[model samples]
Target chain A: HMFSRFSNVVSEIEKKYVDKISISEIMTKAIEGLLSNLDAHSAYLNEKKFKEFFGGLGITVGMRDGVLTVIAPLEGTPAYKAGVKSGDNILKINNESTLSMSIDDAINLMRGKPKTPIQITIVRKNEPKPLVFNIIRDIIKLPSVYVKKIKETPYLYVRVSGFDKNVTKSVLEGLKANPKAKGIVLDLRGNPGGLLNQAVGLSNLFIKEGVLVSQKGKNKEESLEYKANGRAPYTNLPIAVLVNGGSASASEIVAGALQDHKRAVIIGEKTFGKGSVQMLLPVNKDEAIKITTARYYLPSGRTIQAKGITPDIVIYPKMINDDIQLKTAIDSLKTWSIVDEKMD
Target chain B: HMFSRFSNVVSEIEKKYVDKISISEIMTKAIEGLLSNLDAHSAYLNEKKFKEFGITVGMRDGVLTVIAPLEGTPAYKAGVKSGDNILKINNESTLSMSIDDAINLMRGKPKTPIQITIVRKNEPKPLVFNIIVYVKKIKETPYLYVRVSGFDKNVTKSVLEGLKANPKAKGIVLDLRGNPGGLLNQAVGLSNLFIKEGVLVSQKGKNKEESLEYKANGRAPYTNLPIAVLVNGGSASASEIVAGALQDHKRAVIIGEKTFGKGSVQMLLPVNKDEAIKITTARYYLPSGRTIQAKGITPDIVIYPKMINDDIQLKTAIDSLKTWSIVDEKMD
Candidate 1:
């Protein structure tokens, strides 16, 4: 029915002399027909025309004031090595002037196979001349978890880059290997979070058996509960979880869960405070849409979306060398008496 | 040469045993030979064996806690239903083990395809799990990034100092875009410093982000310089505190996209330090008496929010929000 109306409108405005209607033209018209209805991420990727257009170059580029700006350089990628700082404006790529380049076009330009090089020109503040760089492409394996075992004390330093399925077992094994450790430092620096279950599981490793973390949907009954595994080998060990602006979803859950249970100390800069949980539902075969389904709350009842978890010991990112937060946790642990009652 | 040696050994053994040589025995010897040199997650699987094994199952049953055979690969589909937490383990589907132990067991399982479902509290088949994977890595000490908006006094002062220390400090770039407006009083105080004799901002509802009235004092300490306030899609909540107040006071130039529509203020009624019920208690308004929630403060110097036209969203609000000022009301 809608197509008939569209056809009628086209018939009403048919030109007296029509140009040759080729396949590309038909497809282009068809594309224009469907473009408005699709979501931002959903678009047609014609096989031959844009088959090579895959893989993100991993640069943070956006348009400001009609000029393309490199707000932040993706770490360890072609853009970063090309000296694209946080505030540099991208002038051109491969001699193509960026007068009004769309972010999508820039993204398309940046993404390519590894080892392929691209020429980039940028203008920075106070710099008189435009800086050009010939950058080589490389595989970007985003590092998530960083673990550094304390040299002597059985305490391990565990940093979760993102909440994934492997986190719980990894933490358990790390603590198990170092039985004599005084404490564990779980660092959530620059972690953008992945899985919520993993965050609850990490918290369960410490607390005995209550609601470690709960998921509240539309209805009260819909609220799901995560009971502490009670099998976390290190119930008595002191734990300190560190968070910064980079910490998001699952990272906050661990910090919130531990803080609620009085099982660990959260230190470092205030977290990014992203508390909304999205359930990625498959709209169809090979397609999915991430929908924000519910909000997560700490066992103690803090929904840390806007207001992130406050550290028991507030430390800054630059002060990690002094280990002020670690010292505070160790010292605080000495005052804390471990309760040995097992879950009934 | 190695095969001949093995054959000689087999022949000697056969002479002692007096039985027919079997392919299974030969294959077993070959497998053991290979196992001696390789690590876990990498092992030979014959076509017959692989066919017999079929689709791989997860290590844990009730919850997902296995190192996915591949990095950045889905263990369970992102849309797995709620109560459908049980994983397909071994050859059968069950929910009887820990997520951690399951990962340990999943080692050596090929990066293969699997189907999964999830159920919430009521067992709604809300999500499905499907994925392929590669080699699995198991390690502790994961890296994470926690997000927290709103800078406390020290952080605010430090930011100000950093801005001042910059030799080319033509103007101050206050980045309060994503900041869930912190310390209501601090916001008020910050705005007051900019306005010598004006109502900074006002609050109406119990929530902070709701609509309200905010007036600024005519007097502003930094009245002489140009200011650029930066904002992005995230510049919301308390971000409006600075953006609205600054814009209303004409103390800074608001730039970037609109603020995050978080105008309401939430106050956690603390049952205790560890536990509290956070409720939207008040709605705050800038001196213009505009709400900051859902509807964010607009920019004075409107620029394309995104760095790229297509990435059209706000950047840092504080950085661009204060680029210009309405210093003196009239007469340029």
Candidate 2:
């Protein structure tokens, strides 16, 4: 009874409103209004957006004051490496003017087969002329693990920007390569999170026993308790995990677990409090719906939905010129001592 | 390939995330978001507000007369007055027009105009009061005292006719106290009476292609008569326009307190058979290029006494318009 009333209202607007509109257009708008209210991450994926992620020069785009604009070229991808900067205005995709093109039209024109070359035209600030670049399309995957030793310190700074697959082995390899290092500063700052199993594996490198994280909810399928598969190496090293507001999802899962197990000191600004999981279900055709299905909890029975992990010591920045959080994380690692409670 | 990924994404969330979810609970917020974004004036209605209830009426020994009109309503503006015995409703006499028959006649679509004829107890045969615009001429010095009870239909005609009746008056006192203005059509014609020629009033809006300016036509009368207009806070939009235009041309000595600052034109436009949207359309301006939106006309010589005292201000206006008092006060 209620369902047809919604359909009836949609029909009334379509039939009676003086100005023209599209049902598909208003359908997405309605879905956006509904889901964005549920949570910030929950969203409606329109047809073009649902299908546009494959084999593209990784960049998100929208209009900036009626001109075609890039939201950002995803870092460590072809677009980012080929010098496609964020906020670049696209005058042309392939010598075709983007002035009259809708956002979906630009999306379809920019994506194609892997290793295929696509020429792009962009306008940047303080530049008289538009710059042209030929970038090859590739799978939207990247190197998330970056391992290096801090200069003048016995610390291995492993910054993982995402928790994509092979992250555990890459960090394990980094730990082996720096076998003589005293402490580790695992920088997960600006990491917007990725795969869940990689988070479980990343936490297991430090935590030895008991629970790593709990996946619990009104979820009828499964309530999960992920225990450490138990890493042998790097479990003894004093570690400080770095996080900020951008660190979320799987990033929060790893940082929260290590801190809860007393394995690492979680440092920096408080993590992003996005603990709920969302699933994209097909609405019809290319349109899809997304809503929160369940949420993650740390092993200590604390939910991470609205309450994110508080840093053990907040290294608040007074100015933008320095990496105060990373420096503090290293200092916090340096003064740490090994006790059995510190052990799992 | 992407379709499977959609299910996988939902599968991942349903299997792992913290809160259990339902996928079906989203249409109301969705539909609400749609109409809400159209424009502020637009709304979607179902069962309620399909129509409006108009003026109240009653039977006087089986003959119909208005009990009272709902204030600022269409019936009130059409001058449907109390105890003006209803003679005929749209050519159908109240002798045959029952209470249900009258209500049923009033029930056509909104913005539909209806005609009613009545016979007042004291004067004239079968008078139609679509609304009230009263003109009174007093005994003192044959100085015609015209009181506009409200700016309804027939204001300019009635006032002009009232002036012609006592054409040999010394000066005039146009009393607009307790008159909350109406009928944008009449203020300009009324103001044109005392002023020969100038821009009387102007109205403009961003919605309009251009601004509209109202000027006095060659048909103004009583241009030689000195006039004093008494207004209080109850004098509103159309009242302010008449006062503003008359004061700008140095025509009348505007007396009493400041006025009601009702500046915009609003209309209840029907969206469909079941819905109507009320929207404020344009703002009015004086000939001097100022808005009466939040600020209204201030009297030339302020009324010093409390307005509750009857005809004291009337006496002052009579004093204000005698000989050169209006002309002298307007000189500065």
Candidate 3:
């Protein structure tokens, strides 16, 4: 009886709507519209699937004040070589204006054939005019993880762009290589996150015991928990985890774990707070519906959906503080309210 | 099987949402939500239909047109002129619909408005009219009583002439009970009579272009005359616009019941040729930027209505005018 109503409405929309339309084409919008009513990440993907890419310009970008902004340009990459700072605004990618540009749209413009040239016009602070950066694309050598000594000053600085594969292995190598490093600053400023397992492995490297992260699903039985392996490589190193507006998901997991165990002080602004994970429920090979299954719970019983990990100390905003925006859009409207009563 | 997917989604939204909810509570949201996403006015009204629409229709060459609205009905008073093609009944196309079906659709409980679309000759677009509003004029000792039954195009001009016609009047009482309202501009146009300057009312929507302001024309007829407006539950749309504007300006003391907050303007957007989404896309704002959509105008003085032409409110208005000592908005 219900789907019959959908059938009737769809047919009626096709029949009585003022303009001419195709049921196939318009229902795509209906399908898209229904998903649009859901959370931000949920979407309806049709024919094409995402292909893997290893090429890069080497900057993690996210929406800052709804503008495409560079989170971090890796230390010695093409983006850094071209002097693209962390706060540099992506004004135009290649040649097109990025006004009202989206993250997905801007990233593809920055990504392309290896060894080819890509241009980005950036708006930096105190700059009289927009700066242009022509960076050559290469196989990204960074692997999203890096460690460096502070001029052999006994303090080590570790930078991770994401929690992608073997990140924990490289982190362990960096910590072990410097046997007596006095302090470690694990910089995850713009890490958007990757594998959930490696986030646990990365957190396991610092905290000796206790719950690192857990998946609080629909019910208690459907829940999953990940604890510290108790094989911390270097527990007593004076360390701090840095997070900011771009640090999300698994990155927040690590920072939250560190902050909880009193193992490291969380530095910088509050995290990106994208604590939910989605599983692709395949309708078929080419088509699938992605449904949110669970949210990440930290060691301190802190759930990180909307509220990201809060930092203990906020230093001078070197990369310019990312302006965060929040809004509530309900999934439904049963009655016409006074909110939309101003336009006639 | 797809409905089973509907079942699954309903279950999932219930199970997985951050807030604890039931499938039934949220399923209602989903049903209404799906319709709402498509439009603002479109909704599943379920089975409850109207009892009397007070309008007759005829099927002329597969197209529906109005015969004649009976006297003293919502249709007759709402300016449903003769031979106006009944384009859509509550945004549903009357074309090819049986006479009984159209009539059934029009039938609803009293005071619950059913907006119908009309295609009059020489108009570029079809007009959507909410059947409600009339006009009358009365005079009492030293006070003018302008009975605003509806907001016709000339209501403001009529009120202006009434003011010029009354030389011995100290105050005015505008009665807007059962006024379903009519033209939006005239509502503000009439309000401009009391308010000399500043914004009378404004409207805004999804665009900067949708944003509009109605200002006092400065040629107000009676700026200094103390006025009291009477309204009831049927005081909707343009009626509320006037009441809200007056209440915000403190130009008049609003009396009677709380007004109907039907301030939104609905548009018929077509997904295709068969049916259109009657979307409420705009809202009304008072001089103080107070919204009157779900929240209507609250009367300054509340008085219960009487069956036998209760002029108790009128008497109260006449008594309140004695309290008005100084005058404001003095523009010749």
> Best candidate per TM-score, number?
3
lDDT of 3 by residue, B1-332 (tens): 22344445555566666446764455444444455445423444433332121665543333456643556667777777655766676766553344556655667666767788886754535678776423334522545667666677656666677677665666777777766576678888888878887898888754566577888777886776787888876667788888877778877888887765665665544343432334345678777867786578889888874221457876677667756633432332
- Interface RMSD, in order shown: 33.8, 20.9, 13.9
- The candidate with the higher DockQ, 2 or 3, is 2
**Model 1, range A48-129, lDDT digits (tens) per residue?**
2222324556565543334556543456455656765544667678987664334556776677667888887876665655
Question: Candidate 2's residue-wise lDDT over A1-344, tens digit each?
Answer: 23453465556556544335687665555445444333444545655245534566766555333456664456657765577765476767777765433455566666666788877777766454577888777775766567777776666677677666556788788888977666777777756567888888888878777787787667556777788755556677778788776666778888777777777888788765667666656655555655555677888888876677777778775211377776677667777733433753
Question: 1 or 2, which is superior by TM-score?
Answer: 2
DockQ value for model 1:
0.01
Model 3: CA > 4 A from native: A4-12, A48-141, A144-146, A151-153, A284-286, A318-344, B1-152, B155-277, B280-332
lDDT (Cα atoms) of all candidates against the true structure: 0.50, 0.65, 0.63
> Sorted on DockQ, highest at the top, how do the candidates line up?
2, 3, 1
Error of 1 at B292 (Å): 36
Model 3, A80-114: lDDT tens digits are 56876666766677677665433444555566678
State the lDDT of candidate 2 residue by residue for B61-89, as single tens digits.
33456644555667766666555567676
User: Which candidate order results from sorting by lDDT in descending order?
Assistant: 2, 3, 1
lDDT digits (tens) for residues B156-274 of candidate 1: 35333433444233444444543434676666655554556666777665323434454445544455555555665545445677677777767666667654455454432223232
Per-model fnat list: 0.00, 0.31, 0.03
Candidate with the larger lDDT of 1 and 2? 2
Best by DockQ: 2
DockQ of each: 0.01, 0.12, 0.03
